[PDB]
Amino acid sequence: SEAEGRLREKLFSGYDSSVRPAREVGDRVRVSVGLILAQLISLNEKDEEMSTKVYLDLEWTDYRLSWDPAEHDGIDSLRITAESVWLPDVVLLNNNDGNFDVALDISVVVSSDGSVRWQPPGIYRSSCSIQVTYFPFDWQNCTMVFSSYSYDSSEVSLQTGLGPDGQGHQEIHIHEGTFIENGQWEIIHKPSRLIQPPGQRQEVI
Amino acid sequence: SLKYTAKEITLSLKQDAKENRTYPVEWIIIDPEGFTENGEWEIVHRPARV
Amino acid sequence: DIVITQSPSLLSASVGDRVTLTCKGSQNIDNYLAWYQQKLGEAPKLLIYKTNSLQTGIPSRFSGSGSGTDYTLTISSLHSEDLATYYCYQYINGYTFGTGTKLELKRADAAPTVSIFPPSTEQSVVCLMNNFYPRDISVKWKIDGTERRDGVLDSVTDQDSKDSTYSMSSTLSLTKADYESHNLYTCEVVHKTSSSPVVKSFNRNE
Amino acid sequence: KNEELRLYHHLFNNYDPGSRPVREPEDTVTISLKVTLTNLISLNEKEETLTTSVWIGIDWQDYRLNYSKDDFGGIETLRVPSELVWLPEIVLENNIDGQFGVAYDANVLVYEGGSVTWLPPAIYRSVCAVEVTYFPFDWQNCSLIFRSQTYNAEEVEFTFAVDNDGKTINKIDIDTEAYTENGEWAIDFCPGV
Amino acid sequence: EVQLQESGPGLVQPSETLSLTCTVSGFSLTSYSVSWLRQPSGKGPEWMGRMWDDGGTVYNSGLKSRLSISRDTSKNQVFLKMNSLQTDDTGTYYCTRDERIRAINWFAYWGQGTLVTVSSAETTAPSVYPLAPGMVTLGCLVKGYFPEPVTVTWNGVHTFPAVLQSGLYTLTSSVVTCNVAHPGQRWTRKLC
Amino acid sequence: SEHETRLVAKLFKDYSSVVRPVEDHRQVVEVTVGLQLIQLINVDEVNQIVTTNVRLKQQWVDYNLKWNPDDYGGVKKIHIPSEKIWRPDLVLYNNADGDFAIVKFTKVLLQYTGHITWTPPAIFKSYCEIIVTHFPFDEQNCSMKLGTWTYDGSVVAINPESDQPDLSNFMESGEWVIKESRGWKHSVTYSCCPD
Amino acid sequence: SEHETRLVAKLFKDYSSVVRPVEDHRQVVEVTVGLQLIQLINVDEVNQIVTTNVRLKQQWVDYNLKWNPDDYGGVKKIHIPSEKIWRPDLVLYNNADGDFAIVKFTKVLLQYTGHITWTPPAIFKSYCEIIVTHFPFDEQNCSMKL
Amino acid sequence: IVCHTTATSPISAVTCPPGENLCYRKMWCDAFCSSRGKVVELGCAATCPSKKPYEEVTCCSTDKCNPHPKQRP
Numbered sequence A: 001s002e003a004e005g006r007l008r009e010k011l012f013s014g015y016d017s018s019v020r021p022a023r024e025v026g027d028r029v030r031v032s033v034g035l036i037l038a039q040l041i042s043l044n045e046k047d048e049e050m051s052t053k054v055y056l057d058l059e060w061t062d063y064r065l066s067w068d069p070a071e072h073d074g075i076d077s078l079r080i081t082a083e084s085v086w087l088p089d090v091v092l093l094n095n096n097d098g099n100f101d102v103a104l105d106i107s108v109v110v111s112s113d114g115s116v117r118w119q120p121p122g123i124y125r126s127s128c129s130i131q132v133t134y135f136p137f138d139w140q141n142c143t144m145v146f147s148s149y150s151y152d153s154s155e156v157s158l159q160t161g162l163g164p165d166g167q168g169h170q171e172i173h174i175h176e177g178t179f180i181e182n183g184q185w186e187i188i189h190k191p192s193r194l195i196q197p198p199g200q201r202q203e204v205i
Numbered sequence B: 001s002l003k004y005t006a007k008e009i010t011l012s013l014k015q016d017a018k019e020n021r022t023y024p025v026e027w028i029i030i031d032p033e034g035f036t037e038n039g040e041w042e043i044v045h046r047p048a049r050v
Numbered sequence C: 001d002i003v004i005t006q007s008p009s010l011l012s013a014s015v016g017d018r019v020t021l022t023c024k025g026s027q028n029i030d031n032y033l034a035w036y037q038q039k040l041g042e043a044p045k046l047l048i049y050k051t052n053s054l055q056t057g058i059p060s061r062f063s064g065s066g067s068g069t070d071y072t073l074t075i076s077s078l079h080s081e082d083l084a085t086y087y088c089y090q091y092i093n094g095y096t097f098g099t100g101t102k103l104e105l106k107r108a109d110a111a112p113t114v115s116i117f118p119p120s121t122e123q124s125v126v127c128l129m130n131n132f133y134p135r136d137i138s139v140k141w142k143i144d145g146t147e148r149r150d151g152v153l154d155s156v157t158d159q160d161s162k163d164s165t166y167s168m169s170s171t172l173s174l175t176k177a178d179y180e181s182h183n184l185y186t187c188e189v190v191h192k193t194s195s196s197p198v199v200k201s202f203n204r205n206e
Numbered sequence D: 001k002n003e004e005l006r007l008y009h010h011l012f013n014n015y016d017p018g019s020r021p022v023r024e025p026e027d028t029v030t031i032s033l034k035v036t037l038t039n040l041i042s043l044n045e046k047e048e049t050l051t052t053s054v055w056i057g058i059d060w061q062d063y064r065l066n067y068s069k070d071d072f073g074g075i076e077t078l079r080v081p082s083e084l085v086w087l088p089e090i091v092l093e094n095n096i097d098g099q100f101g102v103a104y105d106a107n108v109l110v111y112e113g114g115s116v117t118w119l120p121p122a123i124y125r126s127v128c129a130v131e132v133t134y135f136p137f138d139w140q141n142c143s144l145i146f147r148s149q150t151y152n153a154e155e156v157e158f159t160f161a162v163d164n165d166g167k168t169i170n171k172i173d174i175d176t177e178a179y180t181e182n183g184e185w186a187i188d189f190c191p192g193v
Numbered sequence E: 001e002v003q004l005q006e007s008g009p010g011l012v013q014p015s016e017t018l019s020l021t022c023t024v025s026g027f028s029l030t031s032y033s034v035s036w037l038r039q040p041s042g043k044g045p046e047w048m049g050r051m052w053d054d055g056g057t058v059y060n061s062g063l064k065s066r067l068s069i070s071r072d073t074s075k076n077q078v079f080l081k082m083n084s085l086q087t088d089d090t091g092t093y094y095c096t097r098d099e100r101i102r103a104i105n106w107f108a109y110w111g112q113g114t115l116v117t118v119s120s121a122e123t124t125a126p127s128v129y130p131l132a133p134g135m136v137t138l139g140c141l142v143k144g145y146f147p148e149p150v151t152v153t154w155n156g157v158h159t160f161p162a163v164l165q166s167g168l169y170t171l172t173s174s175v176v177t178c179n180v181a182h183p184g185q186r187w188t189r190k191l192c
Numbered sequence F: 001s002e003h004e005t006r007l008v009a010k011l012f013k014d015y016s017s018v019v020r021p022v023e024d025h026r027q028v029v030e031v032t033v034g035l036q037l038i039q040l041i042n043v044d045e046v047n048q049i050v051t052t053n054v055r056l057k058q059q060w061v062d063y064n065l066k067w068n069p070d071d072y073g074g075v076k077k078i079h080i081p082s083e084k085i086w087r088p089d090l091v092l093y094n095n096a097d098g099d100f101a102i103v104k105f106t107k108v109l110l111q112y113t114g115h116i117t118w119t120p121p122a123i124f125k126s127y128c129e130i131i132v133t134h135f136p137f138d139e140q141n142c143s144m145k146l147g148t149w150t151y152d153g154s155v156v157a158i159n160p161e162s163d164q165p166d167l168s169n170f171m172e173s174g175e176w177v178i179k180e181s182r183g184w185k186h187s188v189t190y191s192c193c194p195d
Numbered sequence G: 001s002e003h004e005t006r007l008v009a010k011l012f013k014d015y016s017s018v019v020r021p022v023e024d025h026r027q028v029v030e031v032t033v034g035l036q037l038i039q040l041i042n043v044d045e046v047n048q049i050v051t052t053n054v055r056l057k058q059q060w061v062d063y064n065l066k067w068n069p070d071d072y073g074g075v076k077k078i079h080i081p082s083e084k085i086w087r088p089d090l091v092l093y094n095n096a097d098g099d100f101a102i103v104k105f106t107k108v109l110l111q112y113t114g115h116i117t118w119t120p121p122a123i124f125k126s127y128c129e130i131i132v133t134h135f136p137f138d139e140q141n142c143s144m145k146l
Numbered sequence H: 001i002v003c004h005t006t007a008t009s010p011i012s013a014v015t016c017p018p019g020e021n022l023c024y025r026k027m028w029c030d031a032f033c034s035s036r037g038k039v040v041e042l043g044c045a046a047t048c049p050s051k052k053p054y055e056e057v058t059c060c061s062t063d064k065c066n067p068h069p070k071q072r073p
């Protein structure tokens, strides 16, 4: 695949993965955050900890990673190992075990317009305050708080990922015929909300 | 594969051959001699599907 | 950005004198201040950077010191060739330059050879003073007993390469036809060697 | 300019951490070893594991790292990442969990005259067989065995550190003013050999 | 060895484009940044922009919309292209070689600088008139000429800088007949 | 981000993370340290271990990491991998069985003045004496001793950011109430060395 | 010290860890393997897993790592990181849930003859066919296949 | 009386507050006695300070009788 190699060498000539892709010095990188729940592994009331297996769904644009497909043999998209592009440092803020990053850095998909999409898998153990009062007939309200650890709201702007129709489907996506159904817990509501700041950073919960 | 999708990689079951005829290996391979059977579970079926 | 103020605007000194030049910012400059020398009509040359580091090939006669908000350039023994304009500038928060301090050769004072010239029939009226020292001087004029005139302007000479004296000239909107605006006029100038103003005047006839 | 940068370049521009600080191959590197016990975390009799937090004081001479403070503006010590200098590779031989090495790669201190000092902290889960014959009124003779993983007795040689009073500290050292006894075990003796 | 020659059009029409060129000798543009300075008429110098060794550029934020900087490493030339010129842009423009430690840059060597002036006035020869008398001395006055330089001679001579009256130059001289020459001759004499 | 790429390239082209970021070796690096307590994970009375989710804000000035904002389009701050810069080696002196030092090398906020702000996360398993005589009505005074492991006070100076830990982000514990907290700086001297 | 640095530089300047350390590819690398048992850590009867601490001594000759001792001041042996040299990829075939191969890459001892001795430590969780009939007077014949 | 104190950095001689006269020096070992020697504490008190079982305390009324071990009185 010679033309793909030549395009890939062109894109990363002088590319710095530690630098966010603001074009002007004041520009903000808008990052859409979505979540796909693969398996609710467990909820532990003694440790006030919920374990989930999820796929993140992060999408942004990097102007440095754009090209004309007609000049590069019609290559309309490129798959690139995530360690070699700039990635937003979106982490689980309310994790309980001290693990912030995703479980596996899979390759990102880069569109010819510079749109980057990343869907890394994750094993997460978010803390969750247990409503003990009605146990074991209780219902629980557990939050996963995703935000950029370092970048301010003036550098990275988080947004809830839209639905396939482009509607504001602010929900945890569940593959209805693929989700591994938990035997003890029934999922009732699964919304998401962008939280505005009161060093200010946004959160997607 | 998470790094490559069905457009990039095509998964298929291993083909073997016997009597010059090929066949797909549609089952989990187990050693009939060296597989130490588990203490509590007997494997009744072991299919494979793409 | 850091505003840079530089003083004294003019320094008069003789060959072999120790002299010091001062530069002061509006903010902390963290010793990131530099000095360069420019003679008239030629490329400037950098003397000092980082407030202490002497530029290669510059003689150790030049020295720099200072910290924080205030900085100084000091010359151990002013040579004849060092008479030039000096500029400080800082380079950590934008680039901003001082107004520049001109270094001039010391001399004895000299009175201005003040004279006046009414507008000839070919014309404008002009007033002048010659070979005065120091260059700092004041001058004034009046016509028909009324001070100043429309279009007043002035033009002063560079320093004399030999005499180190200075000269000046001034003019007003008084053409040969416009000369009828007054019956007579006068001009005068003052300097260190003439406390009373030296003056010259013309009547209705030159 | 920072004199530490000149000193670092003077020492390490021509250096090989892979080889011992010996002029001839038959020379032994003398190691001064001292172990300071901060707390005895637990002794688990079911697993026969003793968990302790110790600091390993290791001193040796490296002639290649020799310098004089008078030539470098009076620098008496330099801090260097331990990965840059040669190390004797001291490990706990009788660990049970497979963690032979120290828990934190602290910087080495390179003193003038070529003396190198290293003081990494470590958490060690050493094996300790339990004498159950008089439980619960028993005492246990746990042991910590330190050796170089790489070099034999003719390449690296251990000696005990010498106290400031001039006495060899042939024992585990304890900060009596800051150590706190464990909630289940008290320490009676801690000789070293 | 290290030297820089500034060059370009000394006179430019308003709203035209200035096209100064800096020529480099004694060093390679690929290893030293080059920067442009201007000193307006009656002002302290200001920084305009930099041509980096890596071939990028940076500009004064107040002039970002107006300036363009480019180079030819083959020619050892650096170019400054500027549009929307106005009378405030009149001054001396210097190109300088920079020097750096880490990320901090400062100007190290200057070019001789090119005097750039802009006006709508066309060139004209000076009118002249004698300084009528109010040691013995005589003088000549001149006005209505553009641009400088201008030559004056007599038959201790003192001359004065060209002064703008209304966007057009004027001159006086002192030392009998003065002889005058202007690049784009004349005589004037003193009498009783 | 051509300006920021050029800036990052030119800052670190010949940066040394071994030597201290002082202008003169006789100067002392001054580090402002501030503990933030995010969550009290556990208290173990048997092993005498307290597990806490914390943030260590560390601030110091690096002399070599200054730049002029006008040279780089007005970039006044950048985020850089903290593995590249020199960092203070804060160690939890009374660690029981956790990690002694910081192991989560999050990005550093660097400013054009050279001011570095670093807030890596950590889980501290501090060791403290547990007093059980009043159990279950007991109270426990447990502590976290932080200091530079290999640098001494003549070489690197640490100062508390505020006299109390930042509890503004503290998740409410379902088992313990923090009645009070404080941070004290201590400066011991040993008989070898008054300097 | 300078002699040993020069030696290490000369050896690995153009060394390759991918090819087998033989003069000719039709030769067979003779590896001598010796298991040293340090401790029987655990026997898990319900899972049939035996945990042991062992040293897996391995010895072989690297044809390319010869040197002449008189060229380097009589240096007859050196210690080098095992990650740089070719190594036999011994795997515990009957591993239950431990590491299959060696993961503690200690340094090897390299002699001037090219003889390499490597004794990495490992914890082997070998699967064992536990026989429980005579419990607790049972004898267990647990084995490790390398 | 004037006694050395370790309250200030570096150690300096300070006149005792009114009500206290005796100089004292207390030294005891800690984990860093391997190379750094015993801890040193200097100050002034109205009476010879109390001593822990592992801490040696010295008390003297003379002037400059409590210097640092590496400095002469």
Ligand SMILES: *[C@@H]1O[C@H](CO)[C@@H](O[C@@H]2O[C@H](CO)[C@@H](O[C@@H]3O[C@H](CO[C@H]4O[C@H](CO[C@H]5O[C@H](CO)[C@@H](O)[C@H](O)[C@@H]5O)[C@@H](O)[C@H](O[C@H]5O[C@H](CO)[C@@H](O)[C@H](O)[C@@H]5O)[C@@H]4O)[C@@H](O)[C@H](O[C@H]4O[C@H](CO)[C@@H](O)[C@H](O)[C@@H]4O)[C@@H]3O)[C@H](O)[C@H]2NC(C)=O)[C@H](O)[C@H]1NC(C)=O
Pocket: F141, F142, F143, F184, F185, F186, F187, F188, H005, H006, H007, H008, H009, H040, H041, H042, H043
């Ligand atoms: C739970 O447990 C923890 C520990 O496990 C415990 O924490 C202790 O809390 C108590 C109070 O609650 C603390 O006591 C206070 O300590 C203060 C800190 O003093 C130290 O630091 C001083 C440094 O500041 C000065 O010095 C430097 C250079 O010296 C200079 O640059 C600064 O500008 C500044 O001037 C230092 O002076 C002081 O030195 C004293 O002590 C040492 C002995 O270590 C001795 O050598 C010196 O000569 C000198 O006496 C020391 O290093 C301290 O300021 C504070 O002072 C109060 O009391 C004194 C009377 O002694 C008054 O004069 C003063 O006005 C104050 O009222 C007081 O001593 C203690 O340090 C904590 N210790 C630890 C280890 O954390 C908690 O309390 C427990 N919880 C509960 C609820 O009990």
Ligand SMILES: *[C@@H]1O[C@H](CO)[C@@H](O[C@@H]2O[C@H](CO)[C@@H](O[C@@H]3O[C@H](CO)[C@@H](O)[C@H](O)[C@@H]3O)[C@H](O)[C@H]2NC(C)=O)[C@H](O)[C@H]1NC(C)=O
Pocket: D141, D143, D193
């Ligand atoms: C705690 O354990 C250590 C090691 O397990 C004990 O030290 C060891 O004690 C044995 C006693 O048989 C010593 O073996 C014999 O020593 C003598 C003296 O040299 C020798 O002549 C014999 O041939 C034999 O080796 C062994 O050397 C010794 N080891 C060490 C390292 O000291 C220790 O005694 C135990 N503690 C108590 C209080 O018993």
Ligand SMILES: *[C@@H]1O[C@H](CO)[C@@H](O[C@@H]2O[C@H](CO)[C@@H](O)[C@H](O)[C@H]2NC(C)=O)[C@H](O)[C@H]1NC(C)=O
Pocket: D063, D066, D067, D068, D113, D114
């Ligand atoms: C280590 O370096 C020091 C410093 O050079 C050596 O000590 C002496 O230093 C002076 C410098 O004034 C030299 O003139 C001497 O030749 C040095 N040697 C001696 C023996 O005095 C020191 O020798 C070096 N070696 C060791 C092992 O410390």
